[PDB]
Amino acid sequence: ARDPKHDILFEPIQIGPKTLRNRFYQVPHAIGAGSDKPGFQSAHRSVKAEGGWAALNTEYCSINPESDDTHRLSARIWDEGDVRNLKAMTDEVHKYGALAGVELWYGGAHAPNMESRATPRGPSQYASEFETLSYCKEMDLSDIAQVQQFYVDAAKRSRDAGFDIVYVYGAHSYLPLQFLNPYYNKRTDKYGGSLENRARFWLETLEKVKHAVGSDCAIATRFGVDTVYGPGQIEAEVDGQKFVEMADSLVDMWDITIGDIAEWGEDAGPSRFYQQGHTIPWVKLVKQVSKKPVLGVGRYTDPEKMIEIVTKGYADIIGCARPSIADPFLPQKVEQGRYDDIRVCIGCNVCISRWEIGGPPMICTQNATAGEEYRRGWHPEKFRQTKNKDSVLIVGAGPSGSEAARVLMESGYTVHLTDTAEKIGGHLNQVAALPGLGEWSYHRDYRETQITKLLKKNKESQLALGQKPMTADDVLQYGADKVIIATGARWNTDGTNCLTHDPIPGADASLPDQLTPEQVMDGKKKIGKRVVILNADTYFMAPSLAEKLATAGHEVTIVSGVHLANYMHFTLEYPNMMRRLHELHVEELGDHFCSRIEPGRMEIYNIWGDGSKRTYRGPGVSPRDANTSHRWIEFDSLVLVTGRHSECTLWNELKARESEWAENDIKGIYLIGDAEAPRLIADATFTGHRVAREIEEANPQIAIPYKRETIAWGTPHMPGGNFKIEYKV
Amino acid sequence: ARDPKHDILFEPIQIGPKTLRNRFYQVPHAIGAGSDKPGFQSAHRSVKAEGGWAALNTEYCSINPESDDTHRLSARIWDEGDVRNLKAMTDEVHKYGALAGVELWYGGAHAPNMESRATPRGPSQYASEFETLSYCKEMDLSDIAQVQQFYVDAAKRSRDAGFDIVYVYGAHSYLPLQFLNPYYNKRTDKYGGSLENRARFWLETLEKVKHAVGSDCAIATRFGVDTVYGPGQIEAEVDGQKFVEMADSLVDMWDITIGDIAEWGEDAGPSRFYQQGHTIPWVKLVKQVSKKPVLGVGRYTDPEKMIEIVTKGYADIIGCARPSIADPFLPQKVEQGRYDDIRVCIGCNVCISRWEIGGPPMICTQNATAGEEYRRGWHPEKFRQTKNKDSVLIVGAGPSGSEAARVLMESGYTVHLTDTAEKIGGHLNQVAALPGLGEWSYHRDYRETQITKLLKKNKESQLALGQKPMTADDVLQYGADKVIIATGARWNTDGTNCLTHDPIPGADASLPDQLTPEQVMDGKKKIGKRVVILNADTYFMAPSLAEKLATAGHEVTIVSGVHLANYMHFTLEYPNMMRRLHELHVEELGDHFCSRIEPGRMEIYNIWGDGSKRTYRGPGVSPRDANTSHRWIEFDSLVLVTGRHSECTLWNELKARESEWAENDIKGIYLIGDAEAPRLIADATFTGHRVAREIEEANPQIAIPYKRETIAWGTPHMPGGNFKIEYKV
Ligand SMILES: Cc1cc2nc3c(=O)[nH]c(=O)nc-3n(C[C@H](O)[C@H](O)[C@H](O)COP(=O)(O)O)c2cc1C
Ligand SMILES: Cc1cc2nc3c(=O)[nH]c(=O)nc-3n(C[C@H](O)[C@H](O)[C@H](O)COP(=O)(O)O)c2cc1C
Ligand SMILES: Nc1ncnc2c1ncn2[C@@H]1O[C@H](COP(=O)(O)OP(=O)(O)O)[C@@H](O)[C@H]1O
Ligand SMILES: Nc1ncnc2c1ncn2[C@@H]1O[C@H](COP(=O)(O)OP(=O)(O)O)[C@@H](O)[C@H]1O
Ligand code: SF4
Ligand code: SF4
């Protein structure tokens, strides 16, 4: 049963002409669907409606072709075709009693317009600090009236599509905020200078939107109350609160954020730098002056933290984005008191990384069904029950193995999960011990809690940890109907890397002066004062080890053959990571790799050291002048972060002895996770989820087709339009 | 009439069971359409069919979901939905008497599979040097059988879709090439080691494909004959020629390329580094040992060069990619002797940049209709004729103005083009003088030639160059019905940049020790020994000026606040550009910007120097510890490359005096190109082309809507499929 203190989270709240059934609200957030993947958009938002979320919003929605985010994917409300596609979502959300909202967006020069090729307009002409090759035209008075009209027209179409909430989006340094912020606005007319002038564009837009649909829709506004850059941009207790007082009568609800667009990781705080409720100091400042309902995200996943901000008067509604992705049923679980069933977001920002890359669908480290609801028909809380009594043996309890176990158990199968390690988690148990990555353990905490609970529902199922390594013979004679090999991967020990695909002469982690990430994390092998980290991986390992070692007093130099922490650009961790490494005095040697290693020293070269001119010089000779940039650098300890390899020996033996499977009544053996190929934790988790869901298919090793959301030639996107080629002659 | 020497280019040639009408062949190349935008795919390929190209191929076509290039866009032939969408293209191409081909693709770990989430397979397990986080599973004998089956099934689907040519794609280091290349293949079984073993996967696949559709389709193979890395990978005279001898009897035509995937700019040679026919030394080696028709791209635009390679026996067919994008009608023009009407490709690779970015449609610097054929109905050789006699005045003869003039003239309007410059071309005249950019002048050569020719067709039209600057009074009294302001943009003189959007204290290009790009190119102002280039632009200007100054003996240091030459990663110029800067001893100071400038010295700081921890400290105080990395560096001359701004003074005056337009019989004035907002040359050209095409619309300043190719909710991509949400429970 639910704890009485949590009752407040279930009181309804009035926002203009609408009523939220409870205080759980999904703020606008990208998922890689927009108006292009209507099924994905509707399924993803509707399961949350079913899960109890009071209101579900689309991601930023473009009001006009001149605010086109291509290559990134945004929603669009340009014409009737968009109204049709988006309605699929509002209809499905209404089905479960929730409200639907749309975030009206105009990006100024931040929108690159790679599809439309149109010219974006802004308060002053500037080149975006985010999209550095994108410039806008300074708006004259008629430009202003025209863009304001775009908002009105968009709001109208939104009502036609069935939206209950319409936002005038002024966060992440988009249009309304550009007029308000002196960083962008250099105008000297009535739209620049003083706060009243700078606030004018926003105030007029709100008034016009409210006039157009205010009687049928709640008018909300998203506001970046502080750009977190100090004086020079927006400060909460200067322009921030004053703007709120000015616009308060026009808005039905305030949705607050902090930060800009270049560093919106300040808003979507990664667990690496920010804890739950990190935004509170800024958000509370708004309630202090507003008379309207206020909400402000802060990666809220804990009901105790939720009631605290509400009772303390910091906010009236609990806005979430990531917590809703990780667990679409969070509100229901809280309502029913099923706290231990909550799948807590680990703040990894991998969901965000997909949006940032531009084009691919969202994925989630915790929830393997995110993005799969529509195309694969995977509901996060409903599983097809087996009609047979097959038992399954799973070797390996890491992200992939533990998820496969969990899903199979939920499906009614008898499961035997084994590992040599003492706890569920696999490599994730080491990774969560890296500086700042503590919350990533929730991934294994959740599976541990769930597997334990599920064991009680089937006494034939078993959890065997701290065991001796399973061997081919052990597996063949275990007596299980099907076997899942989820043995993982290990970091390369011989220098093997993506640049050469070959070992590096002299690399050997068994030597006393060389180490792998595993040896560093175990903390047994001695590490000298001067450390060089040789890197060929673009994610978190090298930067994280650098931080760990530097804080421990070592002198660290990273020699990187690939762009250091490239993937961190997408997870929004990059800016603060570079700052952290800088304050720790970590030296970076980019554009360099290693040709050979000796005890205490290694030979490095610039990767752009070969001659620029290509000349055919016949066989045996390189077509460019030789790279002569080689130089030696010394080290006390060399840490190798060159790549990973699948630990698939067990699998290889089983495959070699496949003729014996039948004799032992083994119907099939499958390879998943890192053992199949080193993946991101999210995908490792996904492979486990997939073989479990498809264990009864013809070949569970390979995925069955998913529904594709691509246009069918012959069908025009514009209702009643002509799909045929028509030249204007 | 056509020069007789060029008759050979129009002789037919037999390829297996098919016959090519002439020697003009469009090899496979991406356009950002794939199987997702059937209209774009069919229109772009068919206009070339109408233009006389003998065969048109799709871009790389995925044979199965486990070879998914998302975020990049490829064609796909996975199911019936794809067959339907791709048939639109083959039908349309056949309608004009040309053949249609498809390039069957499986990419190994090079395909990141961000949409499918499937696991790629390869000869050995490796992390792609291109997609550094993407690993594949080592294939066992059943894996090999299954992948070869994918090819067979895709080939059968291709025939159903109406393709005449089917490729087994083995270039750009994709699957077949991975088995052949020791760099990837570390196998020790019958598929690795010796050449016969390394060639086995390709030979077997060719054989099975030929067996499945060889009687109905010509079987072609695209092969990267030399990886241009020297010993270690594929070398033309070693494994190259021998594999050709081995596979010769199986193929109907050889399509040859050089280079890998990480550096395919070696194939798609940028004019900055390679001239027309740059691949000859390698391509000719294949003809030397083959008994089948051979073709090898080399940015062929000149018919004289085309006959040279054919008569000298270097190739039998003229394969083109970029040349066909710049001019879909190149074949017809050569056939009719209209040599001066050929729109020559400048080898800028901006078309390619769009594919590389991932998701956006292709655009062309020379051909503003590329990508616009279907959605806007713009035919590159057909223009709607005007029914009135309006005269249009165009101020500025750069890429935008000259293109607007060309299109209006082709449409029958009376045009008056004027500029203060002595020649057509605007800023492009200075740009084409930078080291290696000489071929970019073809953009202005083409327009100079066409305008000159079009003047003869209407004696009222006029070209006035070398004139005094047009003033507002001059424009008002000129007597034109409509005016187009195309006055361009200039580089900032006060340090204004995308990072701060403000001037830099002490920046002033009128000072003796500071210069702008224009001042450097004019060659008048003196430049001292030690040069510092302050950059905040991500394209070619800073690197090009650095090269120019270094070769002239100056000591150059580039202080860059953004990723130096970032956009060049996309144009494939980056690798050779960095090697060039390295040879020239150009020092790079990335992740640094400038706070203030003094005579002979400037203060720089690390952009990541602020504290990593964010703490709310109230208004007036920055939430992070202060950046204290500031230090001073000296210079003899400082070159400012911080950004551009529109030169729109004339426009501003005309708009201020808008009440005077009517009395002067001016129906409208429009702002285009860089003067509206600094753009890439391709987009500047596009704005001119667009106002010209839409001069009669209600508001020519803003583009009319284009046909959108997005799915319509309610229509399944799979014929007969179910579009509704269906959960598997
Ligand atoms: C995948 C993703 C994409 C985002 N896209 C948007 C967007 O379209 N519009 C917007 O206003 N905010 C966007 N956000 C920001 C979120 O609305 C939110 O402010 C941020 O994730 C912090 O909320 P949380 O801590 O509850 O996740 C995005 C966040 C996520 C997780
Ligand atoms: C826009 C573009 C995309 C390309 N995509 C492909 C592709 O899908 N498949 C392929 O085999 N080659 C691709 N290429 C390579 C071209 O086929 C060709 O080898 C290269 O551009 C050199 O030919 P050219 O010099 O005539 O342009 C691409 C080139 C271009 C221009
Ligand atoms: N032969 C074996 N018997 C039992 N457990 C094994 C065996 N080989 C490996 N393991 C375990 O398999 C697990 C693999 O987990 P992990 O590396 O996290 O992979 P993934 O990310 O694919 O889940 C590890 O906990 C490892 O101890
Ligand atoms: N007042 C003016 N009268 C005539 N020509 C002008 C005037 N101001 C600028 N121009 C010319 O306009 C042209 C702008 O060209 P450019 O910078 O190449 O722009 P775009 O790239 O937009 O075509 C330059 O050739 C410049 O000399
Ligand atoms: S991908 Fe990570 S940050 Fe995003 S919702 Fe999932 S667990 Fe949270
Ligand atoms: S964009 Fe450039 S390289 Fe490409 S076809 Fe056009 S002119 Fe040629």
PDB file of N, CA, C and O in Angstrom, chain B residues 457-492:
ATOM      1  N   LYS B 457      20.101  37.167 -76.548  1.00  0.00           N
ATOM      2  CA  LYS B 457      18.695  36.840 -76.761  1.00  0.00           C
ATOM      3  C   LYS B 457      17.689  37.912 -76.362  1.00  0.00           C
ATOM      4  O   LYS B 457      16.483  37.727 -76.531  1.00  0.00           O
ATOM      5  N   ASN B 458      18.167  39.021 -75.814  1.00  0.00           N
ATOM      6  CA  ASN B 458      17.284  40.110 -75.414  1.00  0.00           C
ATOM      7  C   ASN B 458      18.138  41.357 -75.291  1.00  0.00           C
ATOM      8  O   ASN B 458      18.905  41.514 -74.341  1.00  0.00           O
ATOM      9  N   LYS B 459      17.989  42.254 -76.259  1.00  0.00           N
ATOM     10  CA  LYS B 459      18.767  43.485 -76.285  1.00  0.00           C
ATOM     11  C   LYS B 459      18.470  44.512 -75.199  1.00  0.00           C
ATOM     12  O   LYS B 459      19.225  45.470 -75.033  1.00  0.00           O
ATOM     13  N   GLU B 460      17.373  44.332 -74.469  1.00  0.00           N
ATOM     14  CA  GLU B 460      17.038  45.262 -73.397  1.00  0.00           C
ATOM     15  C   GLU B 460      17.782  44.921 -72.104  1.00  0.00           C
ATOM     16  O   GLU B 460      17.945  45.780 -71.230  1.00  0.00           O
ATOM     17  N   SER B 461      18.242  43.675 -71.991  1.00  0.00           N
ATOM     18  CA  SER B 461      18.995  43.236 -70.817  1.00  0.00           C
ATOM     19  C   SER B 461      20.394  43.844 -70.892  1.00  0.00           C
ATOM     20  O   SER B 461      20.921  44.115 -71.980  1.00  0.00           O
ATOM     21  N   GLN B 462      21.019  44.024 -69.741  1.00  0.00           N
ATOM     22  CA  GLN B 462      22.308  44.667 -69.728  1.00  0.00           C
ATOM     23  C   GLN B 462      23.209  44.187 -68.594  1.00  0.00           C
ATOM     24  O   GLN B 462      22.740  43.783 -67.525  1.00  0.00           O
ATOM     25  N   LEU B 463      24.508  44.237 -68.847  1.00  0.00           N
ATOM     26  CA  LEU B 463      25.512  43.846 -67.890  1.00  0.00           C
ATOM     27  C   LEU B 463      26.363  45.092 -67.720  1.00  0.00           C
ATOM     28  O   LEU B 463      26.907  45.601 -68.702  1.00  0.00           O
ATOM     29  N   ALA B 464      26.453  45.607 -66.497  1.00  0.00           N
ATOM     30  CA  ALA B 464      27.242  46.808 -66.222  1.00  0.00           C
ATOM     31  C   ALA B 464      28.204  46.565 -65.073  1.00  0.00           C
ATOM     32  O   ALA B 464      27.824  46.656 -63.905  1.00  0.00           O
ATOM     33  N   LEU B 465      29.459  46.297 -65.403  1.00  0.00           N
ATOM     34  CA  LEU B 465      30.486  46.031 -64.400  1.00  0.00           C
ATOM     35  C   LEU B 465      31.436  47.211 -64.337  1.00  0.00           C
ATOM     36  O   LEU B 465      31.408  48.074 -65.209  1.00  0.00           O
ATOM     37  N   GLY B 466      32.289  47.231 -63.321  1.00  0.00           N
ATOM     38  CA  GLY B 466      33.243  48.314 -63.155  1.00  0.00           C
ATOM     39  C   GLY B 466      32.572  49.655 -62.876  1.00  0.00           C
ATOM     40  O   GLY B 466      33.198  50.708 -63.009  1.00  0.00           O
ATOM     41  N   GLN B 467      31.309  49.607 -62.461  1.00  0.00           N
ATOM     42  CA  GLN B 467      30.525  50.799 -62.176  1.00  0.00           C
ATOM     43  C   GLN B 467      30.771  51.358 -60.783  1.00  0.00           C
ATOM     44  O   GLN B 467      31.387  50.716 -59.929  1.00  0.00           O
ATOM     45  N   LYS B 468      30.278  52.568 -60.549  1.00  0.00           N
ATOM     46  CA  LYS B 468      30.422  53.160 -59.235  1.00  0.00           C
ATOM     47  C   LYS B 468      29.322  52.501 -58.381  1.00  0.00           C
ATOM     48  O   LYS B 468      28.294  52.054 -58.905  1.00  0.00           O
ATOM     49  N   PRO B 469      29.555  52.373 -57.071  1.00  0.00           N
ATOM     50  CA  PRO B 469      28.590  51.757 -56.157  1.00  0.00           C
ATOM     51  C   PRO B 469      27.179  52.307 -56.283  1.00  0.00           C
ATOM     52  O   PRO B 469      26.982  53.518 -56.240  1.00  0.00           O
ATOM     53  N   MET B 470      26.204  51.414 -56.404  1.00  0.00           N
ATOM     54  CA  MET B 470      24.808  51.817 -56.479  1.00  0.00           C
ATOM     55  C   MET B 470      24.408  52.410 -55.129  1.00  0.00           C
ATOM     56  O   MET B 470      24.817  51.893 -54.091  1.00  0.00           O
ATOM     57  N   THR B 471      23.641  53.499 -55.143  1.00  0.00           N
ATOM     58  CA  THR B 471      23.144  54.125 -53.917  1.00  0.00           C
ATOM     59  C   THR B 471      21.633  53.940 -53.939  1.00  0.00           C
ATOM     60  O   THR B 471      21.072  53.507 -54.957  1.00  0.00           O
ATOM     61  N   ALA B 472      20.969  54.300 -52.846  1.00  0.00           N
ATOM     62  CA  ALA B 472      19.525  54.140 -52.748  1.00  0.00           C
ATOM     63  C   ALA B 472      18.810  54.980 -53.795  1.00  0.00           C
ATOM     64  O   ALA B 472      17.862  54.517 -54.440  1.00  0.00           O
ATOM     65  N   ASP B 473      19.293  56.204 -53.989  1.00  0.00           N
ATOM     66  CA  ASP B 473      18.713  57.100 -54.979  1.00  0.00           C
ATOM     67  C   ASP B 473      18.871  56.503 -56.361  1.00  0.00           C
ATOM     68  O   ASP B 473      17.923  56.499 -57.144  1.00  0.00           O
ATOM     69  N   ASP B 474      20.050  55.955 -56.643  1.00  0.00           N
ATOM     70  CA  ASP B 474      20.288  55.313 -57.934  1.00  0.00           C
ATOM     71  C   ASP B 474      19.278  54.195 -58.187  1.00  0.00           C
ATOM     72  O   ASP B 474      18.714  54.096 -59.278  1.00  0.00           O
ATOM     73  N   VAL B 475      19.034  53.366 -57.174  1.00  0.00           N
ATOM     74  CA  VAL B 475      18.095  52.256 -57.317  1.00  0.00           C
ATOM     75  C   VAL B 475      16.670  52.739 -57.513  1.00  0.00           C
ATOM     76  O   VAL B 475      15.962  52.242 -58.391  1.00  0.00           O
ATOM     77  N   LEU B 476      16.250  53.707 -56.704  1.00  0.00           N
ATOM     78  CA  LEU B 476      14.892  54.241 -56.798  1.00  0.00           C
ATOM     79  C   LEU B 476      14.569  54.815 -58.175  1.00  0.00           C
ATOM     80  O   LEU B 476      13.463  54.642 -58.687  1.00  0.00           O
ATOM     81  N   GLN B 477      15.556  55.458 -58.786  1.00  0.00           N
ATOM     82  CA  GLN B 477      15.383  56.090 -60.093  1.00  0.00           C
ATOM     83  C   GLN B 477      15.802  55.265 -61.304  1.00  0.00           C
ATOM     84  O   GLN B 477      15.711  55.745 -62.433  1.00  0.00           O
ATOM     85  N   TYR B 478      16.254  54.037 -61.088  1.00  0.00           N
ATOM     86  CA  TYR B 478      16.699  53.206 -62.199  1.00  0.00           C
ATOM     87  C   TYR B 478      15.603  52.867 -63.206  1.00  0.00           C
ATOM     88  O   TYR B 478      15.881  52.749 -64.396  1.00  0.00           O
ATOM     89  N   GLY B 479      14.373  52.685 -62.743  1.00  0.00           N
ATOM     90  CA  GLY B 479      13.303  52.357 -63.670  1.00  0.00           C
ATOM     91  C   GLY B 479      12.993  50.874 -63.817  1.00  0.00           C
ATOM     92  O   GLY B 479      12.265  50.477 -64.735  1.00  0.00           O
ATOM     93  N   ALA B 480      13.537  50.044 -62.926  1.00  0.00           N
ATOM     94  CA  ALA B 480      13.271  48.606 -62.979  1.00  0.00           C
ATOM     95  C   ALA B 480      11.993  48.311 -62.204  1.00  0.00           C
ATOM     96  O   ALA B 480      11.648  49.030 -61.263  1.00  0.00           O
ATOM     97  N   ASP B 481      11.287  47.257 -62.582  1.00  0.00           N
ATOM     98  CA  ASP B 481      10.052  46.912 -61.885  1.00  0.00           C
ATOM     99  C   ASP B 481      10.308  46.245 -60.531  1.00  0.00           C
ATOM    100  O   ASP B 481       9.584  46.476 -59.552  1.00  0.00           O
ATOM    101  N   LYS B 482      11.339  45.410 -60.485  1.00  0.00           N
ATOM    102  CA  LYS B 482      11.714  44.693 -59.273  1.00  0.00           C
ATOM    103  C   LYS B 482      13.216  44.795 -59.120  1.00  0.00           C
ATOM    104  O   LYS B 482      13.944  44.885 -60.106  1.00  0.00           O
ATOM    105  N   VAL B 483      13.675  44.855 -57.882  1.00  0.00           N
ATOM    106  CA  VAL B 483      15.094  44.987 -57.595  1.00  0.00           C
ATOM    107  C   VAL B 483      15.552  43.853 -56.679  1.00  0.00           C
ATOM    108  O   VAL B 483      14.842  43.461 -55.752  1.00  0.00           O
ATOM    109  N   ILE B 484      16.737  43.323 -56.941  1.00  0.00           N
ATOM    110  CA  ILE B 484      17.288  42.259 -56.120  1.00  0.00           C
ATOM    111  C   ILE B 484      18.611  42.741 -55.575  1.00  0.00           C
ATOM    112  O   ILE B 484      19.507  43.086 -56.346  1.00  0.00           O
ATOM    113  N   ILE B 485      18.707  42.846 -54.251  1.00  0.00           N
ATOM    114  CA  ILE B 485      19.952  43.275 -53.597  1.00  0.00           C
ATOM    115  C   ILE B 485      20.757  42.012 -53.246  1.00  0.00           C
ATOM    116  O   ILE B 485      20.293  41.161 -52.478  1.00  0.00           O
ATOM    117  N   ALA B 486      21.941  41.889 -53.846  1.00  0.00           N
ATOM    118  CA  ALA B 486      22.824  40.740 -53.653  1.00  0.00           C
ATOM    119  C   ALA B 486      24.223  41.265 -53.372  1.00  0.00           C
ATOM    120  O   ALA B 486      25.211  40.820 -53.968  1.00  0.00           O
ATOM    121  N   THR B 487      24.304  42.188 -52.426  1.00  0.00           N
ATOM    122  CA  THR B 487      25.555  42.835 -52.080  1.00  0.00           C
ATOM    123  C   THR B 487      26.605  42.087 -51.240  1.00  0.00           C
ATOM    124  O   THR B 487      27.627  42.663 -50.873  1.00  0.00           O
ATOM    125  N   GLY B 488      26.359  40.819 -50.921  1.00  0.00           N
ATOM    126  CA  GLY B 488      27.350  40.047 -50.191  1.00  0.00           C
ATOM    127  C   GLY B 488      27.594  40.252 -48.707  1.00  0.00           C
ATOM    128  O   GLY B 488      26.756  40.781 -47.969  1.00  0.00           O
ATOM    129  N   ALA B 489      28.768  39.800 -48.281  1.00  0.00           N
ATOM    130  CA  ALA B 489      29.189  39.867 -46.897  1.00  0.00           C
ATOM    131  C   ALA B 489      30.693  40.106 -46.855  1.00  0.00           C
ATOM    132  O   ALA B 489      31.385  39.917 -47.859  1.00  0.00           O
ATOM    133  N   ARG B 490      31.195  40.532 -45.699  1.00  0.00           N
ATOM    134  CA  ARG B 490      32.625  40.776 -45.508  1.00  0.00           C
ATOM    135  C   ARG B 490      33.026  40.169 -44.161  1.00  0.00           C
ATOM    136  O   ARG B 490      32.188  40.001 -43.269  1.00  0.00           O
ATOM    137  N   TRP B 491      34.307  39.877 -44.004  1.00  0.00           N
ATOM    138  CA  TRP B 491      34.803  39.309 -42.765  1.00  0.00           C
ATOM    139  C   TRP B 491      34.845  40.402 -41.709  1.00  0.00           C
ATOM    140  O   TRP B 491      35.065  41.569 -42.027  1.00  0.00           O
ATOM    141  N   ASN B 492      34.556  40.032 -40.469  1.00  0.00           N
ATOM    142  CA  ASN B 492      34.538  40.978 -39.372  1.00  0.00           C
ATOM    143  C   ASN B 492      35.908  41.620 -39.149  1.00  0.00           C
ATOM    144  O   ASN B 492      36.953  40.959 -39.235  1.00  0.00           O
TER     145      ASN B 492
END
